[PDB]
Amino acid sequence: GPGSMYGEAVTEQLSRLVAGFVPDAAGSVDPDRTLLEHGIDSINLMNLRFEITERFGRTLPLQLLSESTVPVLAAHLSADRAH
């Protein structure tokens, strides 16, 4: 009808989080590359895993985190509604 509500996106919330864990001179994460392509070491993948646990109530293995991109990880987190 005349009223509408757009809502927030999980891909943005994980994107701006992962942009805080890239160890290279990169200023932001590229969505078409993996966390292993950004070169994120196990310590920072475990810090990302803990932040995702606190923010979404979800936990994922380092073997998935290294092989996955930002949209692929966001699709696993977005598998149930929270709003």
Query: Quick one: tokens of 83?
Result: 């709003």
**Which residue stretches of 1-83 are H helix?**
10-18, 42-56, 62-67, 70-77
Q: Min. distance of Cβ 42 from ligand PNS in angstroms? A: 3
When the beta carbons of 12 and 61 are compared against ligand PNS, the nearer one is: 61
When the beta carbons of 17 and 62 are compared against ligand PNS, the nearer one is: 62
36 binds ligand PNS (CB under 6 A): no
Q: Which of 2, 1, 33 is nearest to 15 (CA)?
A: 33
Where on the chain is the footprint of ligand PNS (CB under 6 A)?
42-43, 62-63
